Amino acid sequence: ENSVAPSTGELALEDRASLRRVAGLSTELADVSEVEYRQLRLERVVLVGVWTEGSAADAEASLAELAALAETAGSEVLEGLIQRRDKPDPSTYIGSGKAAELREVVLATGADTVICDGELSPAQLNALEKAVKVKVIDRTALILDIFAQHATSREGKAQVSLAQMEYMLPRLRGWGESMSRQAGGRAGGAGGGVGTRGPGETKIETDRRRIRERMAKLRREIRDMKKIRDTQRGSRRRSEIPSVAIVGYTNAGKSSLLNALTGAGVLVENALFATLEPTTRRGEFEDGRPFVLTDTVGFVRHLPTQLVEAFRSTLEEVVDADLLIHVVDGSDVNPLAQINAVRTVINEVVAEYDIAPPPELLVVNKIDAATGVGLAQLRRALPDAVFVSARTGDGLDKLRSRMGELVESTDATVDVTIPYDRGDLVARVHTDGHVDATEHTDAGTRIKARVPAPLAATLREYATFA
Amino acid sequence: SSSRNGRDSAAQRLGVKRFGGQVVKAGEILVRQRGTHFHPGVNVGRGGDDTLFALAPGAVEFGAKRGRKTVNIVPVARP
RNA sequence: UCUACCCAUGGCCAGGGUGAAGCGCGGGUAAGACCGCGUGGAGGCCCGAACCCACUUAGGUUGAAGACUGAGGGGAUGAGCUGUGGGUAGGGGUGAAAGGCCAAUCAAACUCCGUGAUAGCUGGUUCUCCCCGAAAUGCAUUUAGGUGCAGCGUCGCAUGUUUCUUGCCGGAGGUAGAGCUACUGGAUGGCCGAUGGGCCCCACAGGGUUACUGACGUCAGCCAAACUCCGAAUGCCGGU
RNA sequence: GUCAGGUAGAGAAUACUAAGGCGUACGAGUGAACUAUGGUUAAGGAACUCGGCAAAAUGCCCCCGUAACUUCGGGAGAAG
RNA sequence: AAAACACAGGUCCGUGCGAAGUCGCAAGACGAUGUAUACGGACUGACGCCUGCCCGGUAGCGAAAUUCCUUGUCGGGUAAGUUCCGACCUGCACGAAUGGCGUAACGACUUCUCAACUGUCUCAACCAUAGACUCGGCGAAAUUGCACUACGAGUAAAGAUGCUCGUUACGCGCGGCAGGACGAAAAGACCCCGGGACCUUCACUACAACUUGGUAUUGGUGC
RNA sequence: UCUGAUCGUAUUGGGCCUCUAACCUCGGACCGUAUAUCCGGUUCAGGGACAGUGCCUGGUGGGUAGUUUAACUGGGGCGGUUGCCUCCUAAAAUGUAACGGAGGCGCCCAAAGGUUCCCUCAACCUGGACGGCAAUCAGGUGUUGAGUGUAAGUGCACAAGGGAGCUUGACUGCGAGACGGACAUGUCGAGCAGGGACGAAAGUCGGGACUAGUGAUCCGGCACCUCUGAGUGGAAGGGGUGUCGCUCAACGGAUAAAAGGUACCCCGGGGAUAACAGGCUGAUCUUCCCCAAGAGUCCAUAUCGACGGGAUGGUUUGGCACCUCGAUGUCGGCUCGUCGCAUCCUGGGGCUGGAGCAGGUCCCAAGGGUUGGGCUGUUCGCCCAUUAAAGCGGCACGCG
RNA sequence: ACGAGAGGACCGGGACGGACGAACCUCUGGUAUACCAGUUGUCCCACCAGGGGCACGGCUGGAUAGCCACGUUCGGACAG
Ligand SMILES: Nc1nc2c(ncn2[C@@H]2O[C@H](COP(=O)(O)OP(=O)(O)CP(=O)(O)O)[C@@H](O)[C@H]2O)c(=O)[nH]1
């Protein structure tokens, strides 16, 4: 093969564009700091950053995302080497001799989890399993494992189980049997689809008949839960109350932003995919216009297509929506990538549901914990994005003002001189309505309130002309 | 999917063969045992495999010496 | 004498169609390949009877018939179909090959004989009453639905009872129960008080400082089948 | 295996007939269902069904006229 | 009845002649009254295509006709369109330097779309004939432990005419239907066990089919 | 006849090359013979001491043949196992099964066997440069701990554990009695020869702390014997004693010698045993509650409901293997039904999370009805056009 | 009713339906094996004319009755 199909140019192919070692970012630093119960995790991880269809920063950020996923699911991540190639291998996933090199790397580390970011096909999964003798990290399976461990409600659990079964069905042969054998209780392998403890002993049922039956059952159930959620949201839909959806990337506040803009106490954890069910709550604009602020599930760069049902609630909230508060954090590697991923999912939803793109109020948080390297055009490159940093109370008033300005009012401004013999007709104006510039004269007042539509028809009583 | 077990040795039919009060002949096996659960008492020998046998004719008796159970043979009065 | 193939010698293939080279040329043309008009009548050529076959369908399916009938269907000058007379014979023949056919039977035809083959497998085994009366267990087994031995049923010996039941007496157990600070694996508390991280006094001497990871130990509390400091009841072995 | 009338017909097909030979060996009846074999069928027209299975349809002679492709022979009785 | 066999063409191997190869113990025979342009055997199965720097080097080529294609995307075809047809597709591929692609004609081959046609169907109706049915004559059959042989819910060797408790039911026919009698038929072909047979083979052991010694057979010299 | 070369006569068994006479030729001619591609004879020609066919002998040898190709098994296959030892199961004697729970094996030791004698730390301090979780060490008690050829019951400072001497209990060769356990296996008192230790002191101590560390018989060896010796003056040709040879590991060992395929199959049987259906069960499946955490814009219960819990039903996949293997016909479609309600219209309650309305979610009350097509083996589904709706199931997944 | 709209009723009262079923044959339409007519081939009735047998009732165009559906009429109810 000295000159056969000149791909094997220099021994290991792609002299420097192949597996190399420069220590990279080395991912997170998670080591033994609390000496207690070694029965914790799945050993150390090594970064192998593929630049395919991207740059070094993009690959590093993506693999850091994968390592954060792994650390949330368990495992440990404290090393970085390099590996690059502009051809996702059909047979393997890391390369011709890169597979054996990765086997040597995992043997030297003493671990069964390093990196295999990106959704794989069954061919790639089983070939890499044969090559290295142990699974390492599959991105889709790892996201599904995080969702399985974080599933709380029956709806979330059923959605995650259906997603895992949809992912398992095509790849039930090699990877399927391997993870059926696996009893260590790790990402995917006995990961379960429930939550704490979970059904690891059976996992995704690793059996064609059982998987298909369970998928059909969960599909019927998810139809039922879609109907149930339709009934639950009917009250809001019929009230026509302004609905504001907090969309954005995983982490990046969002849940914190909800708990700040309101008095809520929704789960706010530093781990990824802490919120699996969208949650709605009261909100009061500065002008008094009530609205519904809803925290949603967090998106990632390439959301697995199996989580369609898991994210259907969030997508429906986006479809209804009236402001789309887009929450991002400036304390990440190039938050514009986060912005772009969330924007692409939003645009996909808009195209699917054939609706006008609702406003998108861009908000950045964690600014207090940001490095401040950018003066006004790098840290605030966006022209009109809001900066809040929920933790230390600041900028939230500006966020509320932008919310109120962007959300178009359905009320109508009126000048009604309600007599003092009515009483109720002015008390209700105060109650359902936004009074301002009310005259103190006991004779015919002139209340310049922004009354809702039904009250706007009771003007001819004492409307006057000006 | 199978079981790694399934083996077992033959039961060695150990234990006491002549209990207290039984009249035995010299050389009669009194206890088949592993080790000295019972120790050779009076007119009782200990075999290579820890088999306690009567050294003299008489009746089997079980005693305790220094906190150790012993098998003795009490001579039987001639009729 | 069926059928497969072959050999010899005969026979049959209604009707209709299409139109394979040499003559003369308009020619092509120096000349040739070759176009066309006539002639000629080739072809495992076409349509289609007899004939041979057997694709579809319906019927038949104790049939009219142990393979057929009706309606369609294929070949129908050919590697055609056929009559007569022959040849090849069984582990052999023949096979455009399907284990197809070789007399309604073929992964080795049929008849007779060996022969009343053998079968740990099914089945059957025919009159009566009197006495007694099981087993479905153990060991072994090319053994597991078989068999050998033992166990358990059926006359004469010894026996007066050695059997068995009850009482009492002597006996070894480690089960049931618990108990675990009695061992091997666990459980809420504070404790002189382990690394002590941490404030540090500011010693790198040396020392309190421990919000928190919490040593041994200790405090009532709890479990075990392969735990036992204990430990029955029964059962068993003897004697009476 | 031989002979092979007539009229239509290309014909030894087919229909009807001459000569000749037969009515062939259970019959008589009876508008049951149902089965079989034929026949017809409004309006649809493959919606039947595994499948146009079966049926239905085209069908002959003479004039015309005949495609893709082709091994230049064909396709071809194209089709119309 | 086919896509299988055969086939014309091809390639390889064997055979120098009572050849090889076959039938035979042998003689002998076919091969063939043939003689490497011929016979036998093997495998393909008309016909056409399938060489890239050097086929002096990495070395079998990287094009194309290559459809596993699951290829998704998109369409064409249906209102819903399978077979299938196209571009985009799919990366070291991948499967064919001779086994893969084409290929007119042909096909009771498999699959599909059309036009026409229709009782295939919506959805069936009517007519005739042969049965069926009635009368006369002749006159079987498989099957059969029985019998003045119900239904329900139970029970039972776990699916009952025969048992239980009830419910129903006058006796006997005739023409029909086919739900049961675990209906008849064939001592289940499936599965297992025991045996057999035949087939395969680098299972065992043999035997048929070839070399060595000396018999037949053996003289000297140049040695 | 040696310390014993050296040449010569015949014989001699091979190898090269040769001519002819055996033998061979389906090469010619002639003859028997009128007939004759037979056959035989004669002759020539050619192989021509060249090749050949018997006997012997290695080798290749599915070309042919006879056969083998284990069993257990919650059917069979696949996988695993097969003998021995230890433990638990095992229900306090013994014994006790399962494809029950755990392990070991099947060796090793000439000084880890015998005897005689003797011992002595498991963890704190002071410490002990180095040398802390450790030294060579010293004390105390830890009270019999502790640890100790290889898993249970034992053995301890009465040492089966740890050291030392002997010189070879390395106790071997002849062994009443008793016994424990089908054969097989296992225990030892004791008597005799010879020794080993301890000796003064006694006269005392039969491989290993003990249970695994193995393989019957046959057939063969190999050493010794006061046996036999196919008429024997006699010997050579077999036995006895002790020892050897089997992963005969399928370990009671069918052969010294053996793998498969069968849907081309056949026969003898089996519902002793699988596939269908039935039956039991109900893990799975299906349909159903709560102290309700939480979601539902305000709020557990309009709608839902996690973590847990409890059942129904017998429509799934199973588990079992109880009827049926001297036959209980399968999926789908057609035809014809019949039944249940677990509701796709008709009546209500709540939500009115419709404040309201058109609508709709949820939970309580079978008479009828519940379409036609395309793609589907299609049990499933998806799609097209409708519909008031295009229900879910049982009936041998009703009905050949 | 809402009383902002968008949209838009319950309950009652009429008209016309779809599917299913029953009866019936006036209509429509199907069938029609002793009806009528046309017509091909053939053979007969001696011949012409006119008819008949056979060829699916030879074929074709109609076709009363009966039987039918695609046709007609009626039904599901109203009340207790
Ligand atoms: N310093 C800082 N930390 C913040 C800020 N906003 C959020 N965080 C932290 O980041 C973490 C992100 O978790 P969360 O707020 O739930 O983000 P999220 O988007 O809901 C995670 P998911 O989307 O998967 O549910 C929180 O633990 C929070 O403490 C901020 O403005 N500043």
TrEMBL record, chain A:
InterPro entries tied to this protein: G_HFLX_dom (IPR030394), GTP-bd (IPR006073), GTP-bd_M (IPR032305), GTPase_HflX (IPR016496), GTPase_HflX_N (IPR025121), GTPase_HflX_N_sf (IPR042108), P-loop_NTPase (IPR027417)
Residue numbers spanned by region Disordered: 180-202
Entry annotated with the keyword Cell division: no
Gene Ontology CC entries for this record: cytoplasm
Entry binding sites for GTP: 248-255, 295-298, 365-368, 389-391
Keyword Nucleotide-binding found: yes
Cofactor(s) this protein cannot do without: Mg(2+)
Residues that, per the record, bind Mg(2+): 255, 275
Biased composition (Gly residues): 185-198
Source superkingdom: Bacteria
Annotated compartments: Cytoplasm
Record field: transmembrane: none
Primary residence: cytoplasm
Keywords noted in UniProt: Cytoplasm, GTP-binding, Magnesium, Metal-binding, Nucleotide-binding
Recorded GO MF terms: GTP binding; GTPase activity; metal ion binding; ribosome binding
Family to which the UniProt record says this protein belongs: Belongs to the TRAFAC class OBG-HflX-like GTPase superfamily. HflX GTPase family.
PANTHER family, A to Z: GTP-BINDING PROTEIN 6-RELATED, GTP-BINDING PROTEIN HFLX
Quaternary structure (record): Monomer. Associates with the 50S ribosomal subunit.
Function in brief: GTPase that associates with the 50S ribosomal subunit and may have a role during protein synthesis or ribosome biogenesis.
The protein's name in its UniProt record: GTPase HflX
Encoding gene, per UniProt annotation: hflX
